Design a protein around this ligand. Structure first.
Ligand SMILES: NCCOCCOCCNC(=O)c1ccc(S(N)(=O)=O)cc1
Ligand SMILES: [Hg+2]
Ligand SMILES: [Zn+2]
Length: 256
């Protein structure tokens, strides 16, 4: 199936998922001079004090930190959104080298990684239903730059040992997502899609202007993960990011 290899990479995904050449994919290049400053955009509302992390799982394309979304525990509201969006999971996309890894690019600039905080619109009742609506999902994207260590990321880094290969999971409770947010909530927003198959066009993307900094050693441990299942030939989990897609007359709005 789909992957990020030469034979099953992004370039091939259209074959199984024709929406791949759709009108609102994901990721895109953020052109800061063409982005439109929208004064009607309200500030983002991130209420994660009550977040309840449960487990960490290697799914073969990344590692996801799953949260209990049975209730309005950790929510996203404000910004360009209408209603409440519940945090279901968070994951990252990283490179084999520091010069690459992010999905979205700013003025053609690529970052070392990109953190995606996935939220689904509660009016739709469940995650599955939300993926059937054009305003179904909201993804909060955060750029990661190599520099100083990120204290709040270490807990995650340390458990990676445990979920080295595809299919492995580990209990991962009492993780506070708040530790991953930058100081500023200034963002860019546009209508897009999931960046991995099924590439469903149901996402309201919110990309934060300010990157968080992580240490070289932190990023390094990400690169130690495997694409493969245990007992299979080792294939390092690096470069799990999709190239920029055509904006196609879509407009990128800026909150600043
Ligand atoms: N019944 C419909 C099922 O809907 C299928 C949805 O796919 C589920 C798995 N994928 C995700 O949840 C998912 C979530 C976020 C992103 S991304 N990379 O755009 O943030 C990519 C993928
Ligand atoms: Hg959709
Ligand atoms: Zn993602």
């Amino acid at each position: 199936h789909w992957g990020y290899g030469k034979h099953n990479g992004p370039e091939h995904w259209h074959k199984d998922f024709p929406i791949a050449k759709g009108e609102r994919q994901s990721p895109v290049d953020i052109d800061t001079h063409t982005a439109k400053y929208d004064p009607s955009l309200k500030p983002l509302s991130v209420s994660y004090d009550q977040a309840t992390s449960l487990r960490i799982l290697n799914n073969g394309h990344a590692f996801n930190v799953e949260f209990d979304d049975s209730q309005d525990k950790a929510v996203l509201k404000g910004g360009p959104l209408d209603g409440t969006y519940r945090l279901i999971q968070f994951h990252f996309h990283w490179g084999s080298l520091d010069g690459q890894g992010s999905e979205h690019t700013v003025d053609k600039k690529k970052y070392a990684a990109e953190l995606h905080l996935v939220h689904w619109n509660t009016k739709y009742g469940d995650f599955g239903k939300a993926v059937q609506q054009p305003d179904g999902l909201a993804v909060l994207g955060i750029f990661l730059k190599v520099g100083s260590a990120k204290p709040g990321l270490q807990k995650v880094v340390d458990v990676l040992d445990s979920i080295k290969t595809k299919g492995k999971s580990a209990d991962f409770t009492n993780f506070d997502p708040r530790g991953l947010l930058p100081e500023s909530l200034d963002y860019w927003t546009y209508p897009g899609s999931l960046t991995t198959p099924p590439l469903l066009e149901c996402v309201t993307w919110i990309v934060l202007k300010e990157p968080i900094s992580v240490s070289s050693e932190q990023v390094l441990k990400f690169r130690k993960l495997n694409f493969n299942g245990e007992g299979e030939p080792e294939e390092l989990m690096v470069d799990n990011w999709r190239p920029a897609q055509p904006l196609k007359n879509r407009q990128i709005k800026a909150s600043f």
